[PDB]
Amino acid sequence: PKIQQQFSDLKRKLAEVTEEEWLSIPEVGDARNKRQRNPRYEKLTPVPDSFFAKHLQTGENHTSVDPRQTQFG
Amino acid sequence: TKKEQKKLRRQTRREAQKELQEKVRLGLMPPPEPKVRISNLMRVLGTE
Amino acid sequence: KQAKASEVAAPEYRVIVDANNLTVEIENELNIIHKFIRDKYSKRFPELESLVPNALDYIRTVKELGNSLDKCKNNENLQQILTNATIMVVSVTASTTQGQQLSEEELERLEEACDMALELNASKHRIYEYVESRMSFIAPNLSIIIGASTAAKIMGVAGGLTNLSKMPACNIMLLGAQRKTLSGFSSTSVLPHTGYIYHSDIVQSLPPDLRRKAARLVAAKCTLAARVDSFHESTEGKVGYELKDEIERKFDKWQEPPPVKQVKPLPAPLRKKRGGRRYRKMKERLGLTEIRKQANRMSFGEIEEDAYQEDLGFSLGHLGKSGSGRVRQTQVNEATKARISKTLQRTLQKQS
Amino acid sequence: SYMLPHLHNGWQVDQAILSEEDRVVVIRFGHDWDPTCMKMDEVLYSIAEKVKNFAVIYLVDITEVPDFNKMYELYDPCTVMFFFRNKHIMIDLGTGNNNKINWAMEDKQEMVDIIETVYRGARKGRGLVVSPKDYSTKYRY
Amino acid sequence: EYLVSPITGEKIPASKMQEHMRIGLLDPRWLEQRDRSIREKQSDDEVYAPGLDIESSLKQLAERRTDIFGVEETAIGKKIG
Amino acid sequence: DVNPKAYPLADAHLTKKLLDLVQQSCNYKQLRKGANEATKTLNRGISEFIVMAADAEPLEIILHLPLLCEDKNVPYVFVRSKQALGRACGVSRPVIACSVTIKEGSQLKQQIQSIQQSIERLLV
Amino acid sequence: WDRGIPRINTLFQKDRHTLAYDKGWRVRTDFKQYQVLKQNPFWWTHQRH
Amino acid sequence: LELRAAVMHDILDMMPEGIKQNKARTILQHLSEAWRCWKANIPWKVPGLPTPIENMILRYVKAKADWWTNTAHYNRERIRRGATVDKTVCKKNLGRLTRLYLKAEQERQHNYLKDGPYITAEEAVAVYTTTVHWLESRRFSPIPFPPLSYKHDTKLLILALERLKEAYSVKSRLNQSQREELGLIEQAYDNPHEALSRIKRHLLTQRAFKEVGIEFMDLYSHLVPVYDVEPLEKITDAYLDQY
Amino acid sequence: NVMLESRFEKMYEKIDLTLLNRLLRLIVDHNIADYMTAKNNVVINYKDMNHTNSYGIIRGLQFASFIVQYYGLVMDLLVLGLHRASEMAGPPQMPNDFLSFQDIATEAAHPIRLFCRYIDRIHIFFRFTADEARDLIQRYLTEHPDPNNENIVGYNNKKCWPRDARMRLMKHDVNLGRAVFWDIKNRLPRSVTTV
């Protein structure tokens, strides 16, 4: 029901926490290092010219075929 | 150690170059010239 | 038996040393009887040696399997010996042994060998139990660091405190390392390079990812404590307590929660830059090459055929479309050739 | 929604707008209990540390601080307004109201983009910047 | 133990010699970097409100919303019902 | 200077010579740092000799090394401080034992032989 | 010329002698959905084969 | 956001008010850290955390997790039924379902490890003998390890390299991981025999491998796993597949 | 005639690594098989989540297609029986074609007349005589009784077709379809895979 009804018993039980117990309560620190948290940067660096060369090389097929290549070779 | 020796050399070089650049900043030593060579003859002094 | 009954000029440690030399003698007799069992059994089911490398497990398996290989199926006693994966592997292999039966007198001889091997195993258990009981007197610091069963086992496998003292830490870490054949898995068996030290409760009471880092430290400190004890110094146990305190402090340091780390704000959405050999090279790498310049273009009104099914709209420009380019084919720039990093290269070199 | 600083009267709002000469003052007019305001405030809270070099975020309750309701037409549940050097920075979000963000933003990155665009455009003395994304639709499909 | 320093040459003994080798080779730029970090990381205004305002804001949120709190199920954003 | 169980304790001049030779062996990649590496070189007989510092707080952690040198016929002494041995070994951390090892056709032959002859003459 | 289900013009392809060693290419084209984070409309075929 | 506000208000009301007021934000830090630990299927335990605060945070995490799972499934059902929905909602739901699936998969792997193989060797023996009899009936000669002077070893290597390469063919903008993968492919193509030696060494000796990455492609009806393998192991695996 | 169209429920996930290693050693050198099965047992990661794929298979591996096809060949053997598998494939000297048989008599020697397996989807075409169908239905019903004629409630037919174009669920070919599915599902151990 009222969100603040499921936590009523725990809220009541919180009263037994001593004031010194309210002061240990460690600060939360991340566990991931300098590379995970703030990575330096990712450059783009376009594709090599060999990709275009091979794409245009795919083609200019042939003028003749060895009479040995069958329906599947 | 090797690391300590390299660190000492690096600190000495950095101190020397920093003092040299402060001297250049204060006119005591005229600003350095570009290190022109035969291969550098046309990148530094092309129009000349 | 006299020592245990009287456990309420002929000292105790002479008995201890004689017993510990008897342990290695027993181990040698155990390995020769294992040799005999393996040699005389590998004509019925010869593949088992390649499936169960442990000597005692092999002996128990040949005592249990015997000449009847129907006892690999619907047999609970194997589950007391082997892992389920290796049990199913040996069942699979025993389905296709290609090995003839054993003669009856051969079975009698092999059963006698198995029984004598088990007798020697029981004797080894009893003598190691006595050594473990006498730990506190015979090696106070080494027992302080790692229990009593672990210290007893490591010096029993090493051959006494004197033999263990002349051993480096990188080998004490490996006291009890079993072959541990991998059956399909990926050397995820926790025993590729682990021994009695790694399976000691002090190392096992850590997260599974710090356990090898803990085992190395424990082995080093155990080497130190064994060297301390080999001359019977620090009888009361100060050195062992200091080493254990150091080990526990280094273990707490590893599990100490990570420090509070600040969030880096975005710098600013907004100066002169140099130029030289590095700038020229980086500009040439990122420069728009003639082949890449020519793929940028596209003829007007000259409709190209849609090559490369997998992605329509992918089109070369004036590369080969017989449009307005040049007569000869364009050449690949060497500066655009893909290369690997410096760290990646050094890892590719350490791999060799 | 409660971690961000709150402005408790119109004078504090005016001083917060005036106190910044190098960061975009981002002010959320609305009620902390409103669902739309809480949705917007989660996003503003998640980016408040990331943009502290060029933006500051304040919250304002439009009942406890009612002076700007008629002035700024603060008659929507949530409203996000950008000021740069005592000047309201209009933004052409494509929603027909170039004066405010009167809805809840679902993305952490889109508000960072909007704040950075406002900052970069307003440094050049522009009263109206153009949002990098058109919000005339929701691209649901 | 009167030793010799490969940096200065003074007679530093056995134990404090090691620390000498950590201090005599300490980079002077480290001092400038640490002072720069102190000057840059301590002149920053707090992004979030202090604890006072967090407690107050949560209190007013509880007061202005009984859909999440209270025992009487009142309206969405009205006063105390 | 304090512990008498470190019996072959060298003098100052021999300490200088020995640390210098250890530095040269580290330069020639003939040095093995640490007690565990000294033990591993003992078991293979690939060691000319062994130097060990007499200042390990537990000293008996390096007295197995003399007993193994006796079994393998390897010269051994004690030096006065661990930090000097560590620095002589190219390691900022305190090294308590190092092993100068054999290498066929090396240029450090004569110095090693002389330091050995000096070493196996002070052992009493 | 462009007829036949293996496309008789594929006999003339430049790579015709280094494709004879590519076996099981349909299965790996189908399984490519588990390696690249994109849906391939021509998962069933291969233009060079 | 209502649950977090309620839990924070409840924990901060029991705060000793006048004696301490700077630790309001660390409570939120703990409340978010516990939720992140739940989302990562990582156990959450703070040493210095008092037991009542621990229990309140655990209750918050359980309530938020129940709502999170229910919202994930409801939204997935909405996406599947062709309902009109934003792109960002689909991406957030995909990220949510990835974590739910991987929690259910860690549980499945743990169950397999605890309960061992489910294949009860008798029927495993049946399957194996069936396969053995089939292969003997076909007179199938087992595939050998690739010989040193394997004639068309380089042809298979080139096929594997081109198969790996034909994923960046249209990706006009590269990436550091993609740049490294392309560099490895080019280095193996320019220097084929050393690459083949490395592949043979990996096949003979390598049994432990670096972790792979898992992503989910959303087909709006089911999630398709996509696995990112290390570029150095991909070359060996591609060659092995071709061979 | 009866067409069963199905797929092994979760083939990829329920592949034992140890059994896969032992099955692969029948085909390839043990080094290669050990390499592949070890490569399947790696750590799987998603942004903070890390587990170890100790049970299932990894589809993203390059050779995962080969492993899946071979493992599905094993299931094809389990379904067809060695005799029918050897008759469909024919003698190794002259292997059969796509769906051809050496002789007409060999084709009609078994209920299962056509069989195909896409990566994990099986299609089996049976042709039953008037007596074999009733014997199989009788065995299925003696195994699973159905006095209320409840077998039509769960039956699936393609709703894309009109009412008279799809399958008619009379009484006999519903029990026959259930019997065929039951008989095909029994020869697959549920531990390995299930339908």
Q: What is the 3-state secondary structure (H, E, C) of chain A?
A: CCHHHHCHHHHHHHHHCCCCHHHHCCCCCCCCCHHHHCCCCCCCCCCCHHHHHHHHHCCCCCCCCCCCCCCCC
Residue with tokens 């003399």: F66
Q: How many CB pairs under 8 A join G and I?
A: 21
Q: Which residues contact H31 (CB under 8 A, 6 or more apart)?
A: H4, H7, H8, H57, H60
CA separation for the pair A25, I151 (Å, rounded):
64
- Contact across the interface for D120 and C267, Cβ inside 8 Å: no
Give the closest residue to F18 by CA, choosing from F64, F47, F50.
Answer: F50
Tokens of C210: 């710090």
Give how far F28 is from chain E: nearest CA, Å.
22
Using an 8 Å CB-CB cutoff, list chain G residues near H98.
Answer: none
CA separation for the pair D1, D30 (Å, rounded):
11
Q: Tell me which DSSP letter residue I148 carries.
A: S
Opening angle at CA C275, ends C269 and C277, nearest 5: 130
CA separation for the pair I66, E11 (Å, rounded):
74
At residue C221, the 3 state secondary structure works out as: helix
CB G11 within 8 A of CB A64: no
Q: Which of C258, C295, C320 sits opposite A31 (nearest CB)?
A: C258
Q: How many residues are recorded in chain I? A: 195
Q: How many CB pairs under 8 A join A and E?
A: 12
Experimental technique, in short, is cryo-EM
Q: How many CB pairs under 8 A join A and H?
A: 91
Q: Which of H42, H145, H237 sits opposite I61 (nearest CB)?
A: H237
Q: How many residues are recorded in chain E? A: 81
CA separation for the pair H204, I31 (Å, rounded):
6
CB C238 within 8 A of CB C166: no
CA separation for the pair D66, D81 (Å, rounded):
16
Q: Which of C286, C295, C338 sits opposite A48 (nearest CB)?
A: C338
Q: In what order do the strands lie in the sheet with D24-30?
A: D6-7, D55-60, D24-30, D78-83
Tokens of I160: 């894309």
At residue C257, the 3 state secondary structure works out as: coil
Number of CB atoms found within 10 A of residue E60's CB: 17
Q: Tell me which DSSP letter residue H219 carries.
A: -
Adjacent-strand bridge partners of I122: I6, I117
CB C247 within 8 A of CB C146: no
Number of CB atoms found within 10 A of residue C58's CB: 22
Domain F1-124 has CATH 2.60.40.10: no
CA separation for the pair F5, H59 (Å, rounded):
64
Give the closest residue to H61 by CA, choosing from H37, H93, H26, H90.
Answer: H37
Using an 8 Å CB-CB cutoff, list chain B residues near F91.
Answer: 1
CA separation for the pair C67, C73 (Å, rounded):
14
Alpha helices in chain H (DSSP H): 2-13, 24-39, 51-80, 87-115, 121-138, 153-165, 176-190, 192-205, 231-242
Q: Are strands F47-53 and D128-130 parallel, antiparallel or unpaired?
A: unpaired
Q: Which residue of A has its CA nearest to E67?
A: A2
Q: Which residues contact A28 (CB under 8 A, 6 or more apart)?
A: C260, H26, H29, H30, H32, H33
Q: What are phi and psi of F84, to 5 degrees?
A: -60, -40
Using an 8 Å CB-CB cutoff, list chain F residues near E14.
Answer: 81, 83-84
Residue D115 maps to which CATH number? 3.40.30.10
- Contact across the interface for H84 and D140, Cβ inside 8 Å: yes
Q: Which residue of I has its CA nearest to H119?
A: I191
- Contact across the interface for F90 and B4, Cβ inside 8 Å: no
Q: Which residues contact G20 (CB under 8 A, 6 or more apart)?
A: A73
Q: In what order do the strands lie in the sheet with I49-52?
A: H223-228, H212-218, I43-46, I49-52
Q: Is residue D103 part of a domain?
A: yes
Q: What are phi and psi of D58, to 5 degrees?
A: -125, 155
CB D17 within 8 A of CB E45: no
- Contact across the interface for G31 and I64, Cβ inside 8 Å: yes
Confirm or reject contact between H161 and chain C (CB < 8 A).
no
Give the closest residue to H124 by CA, choosing from B25, C269, I191.
Answer: I191
- Contact across the interface for H28 and D139, Cβ inside 8 Å: no
Q: Is residue D125 part of a domain?
A: yes
Q: Which residue of G has its CA nearest to A62?
A: G12
State in Å, rounded, how far the first CA of chain H is from the last one: 56
CB A6 within 8 A of CB H63: yes
Range of the domain at D62: 2-136
Q: Which of A27, A31, A50 sits opposite C332 (nearest CB)?
A: A50
**Which amino acid is residue H118, in one-letter code?**
Y
Residue A30 vs residues A27, A36, C168, C210, C261: alpha-carbon distances, Å:
10, 10, 38, 19, 6
Give the closest residue to E59 by CA, choosing from H26, A6, D1, H9.
Answer: H9
Q: Which residues contact H99 (CB under 8 A, 6 or more apart)?
A: H39, H41, I46, I49
Confirm or reject contact between C260 and chain D (CB < 8 A).
no
Q: Is residue D26 part of a domain?
A: yes
- Contact across the interface for F81 and E1, Cβ inside 8 Å: yes
Residue with tokens 């703030």: A38
Using an 8 Å CB-CB cutoff, list chain G residues near H226.
Answer: 33-37
Burial of C203 (0-12, 13-18, 19+ CB in 10 A): buried
Chain-centre distance for alpha carbon H50: 35
3-state secondary structure D26-94: EEEEECCCCHHHHHHHHHHHHHHCCCCCCEEEEEECCCCCCCHHHHHCCCCCEEEEEECCCCECEEECC
Q: What is the dihedral of CA A29, A34, A38, A42, to 10 degrees?
A: -160
- Contact across the interface for E14 and F81, Cβ inside 8 Å: yes
Q: Which of C258, C289, C307 sits opposite A49 (nearest CB)?
A: C289
CA separation for the pair I63, H237 (Å, rounded):
6
Q: Which residues contact I78 (CB under 8 A, 6 or more apart)?
A: H127, H130, I187, I188, I189, I192
Q: Tell me which DSSP letter residue I28 carries.
A: B
Number of CB atoms found within 10 A of residue E16's CB: 12
Give the closest residue to D116 by CA, choosing from D59, D54, D45.
Answer: D54
Confirm or reject contact between B4 and chain E (CB < 8 A).
yes
Residue with tokens 């990649």: F29
Q: Which residues contact C29 (CB under 8 A, 6 or more apart)?
A: C120
Domain count, chain D: 1
What is the DSSP track for F19-44?
HHHHHHHHHTT-EEESHHHHHHHHTT
Tokens of I97: 């074609």
At residue H52, the 3 state secondary structure works out as: helix
Q: Is residue D141 part of a domain?
A: no
Opening angle at CA I71, ends I65 and I75, nearest 5: 135
- Contact across the interface for H227 and I53, Cβ inside 8 Å: no
Chain-centre distance for alpha carbon F72: 15
Give the closest residue to C203 by CA, choosing from C243, C286, C160, C147.
Answer: C147
Q: Which of F36, F58, F68 sits opposite C170 (nearest CB)?
A: F36
Give the closest residue to I105 by CA, choosing from I113, I96, I97.
Answer: I113
CB I60 within 8 A of CB H212: yes
Give the closest residue to H214 by CA, choosing from I43, I17, I12, C187.
Answer: I43
Adjacent-strand bridge partners of I7: I121
Give the closest residue to C251 by CA, choosing from C220, C219, C207.
Answer: C207
Q: Which of C88, C187, C188 sits opposite I18 (nearest CB)?
A: C88
Give how far E25 is from chain B: nearest CA, Å.
7
CA separation for the pair G10, A70 (Å, rounded):
11
Give the closest residue to C87 by CA, choosing from I74, H125, I32.
Answer: H125
At residue D129, the 3 state secondary structure works out as: strand
- Contact across the interface for I46 and H102, Cβ inside 8 Å: yes
CA separation for the pair C237, D87 (Å, rounded):
77
Q: Which residue of H has its CA nearest to E61?
A: H5
- Contact across the interface for I22 and C184, Cβ inside 8 Å: yes
Helix (H) or strand (E) holding F83: helix F82-88
CB F32 within 8 A of CB F41: yes
Confirm or reject contact between H207 and chain C (CB < 8 A).
yes
Q: Which residues contact B6 (CB under 8 A, 6 or more apart)?
A: none
CB I68 within 8 A of CB I120: yes
Q: What is the dihedral of CA H48, H49, H50, H55, to 10 degrees?
A: -150
Q: Is residue D9 part of a domain?
A: yes
Adjacent-strand bridge partners of C344: none
Helix (H) or strand (E) holding H228: strand H223-228
Using an 8 Å CB-CB cutoff, list chain H residues near D107.
Answer: 88
Number of CB atoms found within 10 A of residue D102's CB: 21
Using an 8 Å CB-CB cutoff, list chain B residues near E28.
Answer: 11
Number of CB atoms found within 10 A of residue I126's CB: 21
Using an 8 Å CB-CB cutoff, list chain C residues near I51.
Answer: none
Confirm or reject contact between C310 and chain G (CB < 8 A).
yes
At residue H223, the 3 state secondary structure works out as: strand
CA separation for the pair E62, D37 (Å, rounded):
15
CB I18 within 8 A of CB H118: no
Alpha-carbon Rg for chain I in angstroms: 20
Give how far A7 is from chain H: nearest CA, Å.
7
Q: Which residues contact C324 (CB under 8 A, 6 or more apart)?
A: C297, C299, C318
Q: Is residue D67 part of a domain?
A: yes
Query: Among residues 102-121 of chain I, which lie with CB inside 8 Å of chain G?
Result: 119
CA separation for the pair F37, I164 (Å, rounded):
87
Give the closest residue to H185 by CA, choosing from H147, H239, H133.
Answer: H239
Chain-centre distance for alpha carbon I180: 13
Picking from D22, D54, D57, D129 by the largest number of C CB atoms within 10 A of its own CB, the best residue to mutate is D54
- Contact across the interface for C167 and F60, Cβ inside 8 Å: no
CA separation for the pair I188, I195 (Å, rounded):
8
Q: How many CB pairs under 8 A join G and H?
A: 32
Q: Which of A4, A7, A21 sits opposite H50 (nearest CB)?
A: A21
